Design a protein around this ligand. Structure first.
Ligand SMILES: [Cl-]
Ligand SMILES: [Cl-]
Ligand SMILES: [Zn+2]
Lengths: 448, 66
């Protein structure tokens, strides 16, 4: 039963005060309050919206040591200078009020306090403007809550596309569908993990069901397997086939997304909490939102048909590049940012791959090595990286089994858009019925 | 009312109507650059953003756990 304590607290004792009944530490309801705070805090700091790490963990089960079942965590103690109360209602239902907030107002539910609690342990700058709770944000609370949730999901979408389930197609990508020998242009709208040594290898190759939307049509196609999908660059599009022109238009665009503030080195450390039964390192949810620099940094970028991320692997032009680096197979992306000349730059290490027919590799490449006769080497000193403009990024690098054949169909990416939906066009996106159908299609099979 | 229950059920499946890059972040000046330019080395001084995604490095927290 891991016990959580707050390092610091903004609580003020002199905010303490239709009757109110103090609930001390020993009270069974104070305990329940602190048990809910601890569980949900733990699931937030070591999880957050969109996490699929428990799925990978339970698949792998076949410094400080800690259990990964966050339902057991609990607050050892309320943050200093906070006081809990029971208030009688005429509605009747009891309410549990927590005083201490500098504004002098109570948190009238454990759910409202949680957002402030999460800010107390996450915001290392103790900046009151980054909290989503009702008492710091008032009317902006829903907007801030929603953005935070979106950002948490973006982080886990990034982690899954580059660490957890990287050998896969990505949300919003334009692909080729192959059904009954028909090449259908489509866009990935949604995807879900399939509920289940060789278990881990099959999941790494086919982790997802894909649910697509034909481009130039109103047709939905649910429950697609990667074996029936090919990257857009595998086959050519037809100039005279009128319905192909929606896919042609989208695959000429690009848009940055997921702006964030890089973290300073003093706010980072080596993994401190691990799984007590398996020594798996816990995933710590970063809170990038802050204040800074003339460089804007971004989680990722749509390049025509493909989605690209930080921590991802991409192909780059080797033409203008010293003789020492022309064996470069891909860049391992470290950072994506707009410099002060307004140019999108990719920073990362350069590698070569050798098909024969792991400490220092990312998990994605460690798995490619176990599952193929392919070996990876960095072409340069471990302490430097290289920077090329977006102009010299050619596309995604795919695992060696991902594509029988080659990708020679480059497209002219020359139009910036504000959004993927803006480039797709709302008339070419899905309607709300899609998600009604989807739910029925995956109701039993999908992971939870 | 029935739409809220479907969405809630899809969320248990990690399925959402929204994902990174779909909608405008606000609700711009970046440009592509020059092809065939020079590709220059720089210093890997502090942990880059990519490593927080990998998990090799984590952000500090104001939390003590026993
Ligand atoms: Cl207490
Ligand atoms: Cl939009
Ligand atoms: Zn707050």
């Amino acid at each position: 039963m891991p016990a959580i304590t707050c390092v610091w607290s903004d609580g003020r004792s002199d905010t303490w005060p239709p009757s109110l009944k103090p609930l001390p530490h020993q009270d069974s309801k104070n305990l329940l309050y602190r048990q809910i705070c601890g569980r949900l805090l733990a699931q937030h700091v070591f999880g957050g919206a969109g996490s699929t790490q428990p799925i990978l963990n339970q698949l792998c089960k076949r410094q400080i040591y800690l259990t990964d079942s966050f339902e057991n965590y609990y607050l050892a103690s309320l943050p200093t200078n906070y006081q809990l109360y029971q208030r009688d209602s005429g509605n009747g239902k009891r309410e549990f009020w927590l005083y201490g907030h500098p504004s002098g107002r109570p948190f009238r539910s454990v759910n409202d306090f949680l957002h402030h609690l999460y800010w107390l342990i996450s915001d290392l700058t103790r900046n009151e403007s980054t909290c989503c709770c009702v008492l710091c944000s008032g009317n902006m609370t829903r907007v801030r809550k929603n953005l935070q949730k979106e950002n948490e999901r973006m982080f886990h979408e990034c982690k899954d596309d580059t660490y957890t389930w990287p050998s896969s197609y990505r949300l919003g990508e334009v692909v080729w569908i192959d059904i009954n020998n028909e090449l259908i242009p489509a866009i990935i709208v949604a995807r879900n993990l399939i509920n289940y040594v060789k278990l881990i290898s099959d999941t790494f190759v086919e982790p997802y069901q894909y649910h697509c939307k034909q481009l130039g049509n109103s047709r939905y196609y649910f429950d697609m397997a990667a074996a029936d999908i090919e990257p857009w660059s595998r086959h050519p599009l037809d100039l005279q086939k009128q319905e192909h022109l929606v896919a042609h238009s989208i695959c000429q665009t690009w848009n940055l997304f997921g702006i964030f503030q890089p973290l300073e080195g003093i706010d980072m450390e080596e993994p401190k909490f691990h799984d007590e039964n398996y020594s798996i390192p816990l995933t710590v949810l970063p809170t990038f939102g802050g204040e800074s620099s003339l460089d804007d940094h971004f989680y990722g970028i749509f390049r025509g048909a493909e989605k690209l991320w930080i921590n991802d692997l991409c192909v780059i032009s080797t033409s203008s590049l010293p003789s020492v680096l022309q064996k470069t197979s891909f860049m391992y992306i470290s950072d994506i940012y707009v410099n002060e000349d307004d140019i999108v730059c990719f920073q990362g290490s350069l590698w070569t791959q050798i098909d024969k027919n792991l400490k220092e590799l990312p998990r994605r490449l460690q798995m490619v090595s176990k599952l193929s006769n392919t070996y990876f080497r960095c072409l340069h000193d471990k302490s430097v990286e290289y920077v090329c403009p977006f102009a010299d990024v050619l596309g995604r690098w795919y695992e060696p089994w991902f594509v029988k054949g080659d990708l020679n169909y480059t497209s002219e990416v020359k139009e910036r858009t504000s959004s993927r939906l803006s480039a797709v066009g709302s008339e070419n996106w899905v309607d709300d019925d899609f998600y009604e159908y989807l739910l029925s299609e995956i109701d039993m099979v999908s992971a939870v | 009312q029935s739409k809220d229950k479907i969405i809630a059920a899809l969320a248990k499946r990690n399925v959402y109507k929204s994902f990174a890059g779909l909608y405008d972040s606000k609700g711009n000046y970046a440009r592509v650059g020059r092809h065939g330019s020079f590709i220059l080395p720089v210093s890997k001084s502090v942990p880059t953003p990519s490593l927080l995604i990998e998990g090799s490095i984590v952000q500090r927290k104001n939390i003590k756990i026993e």
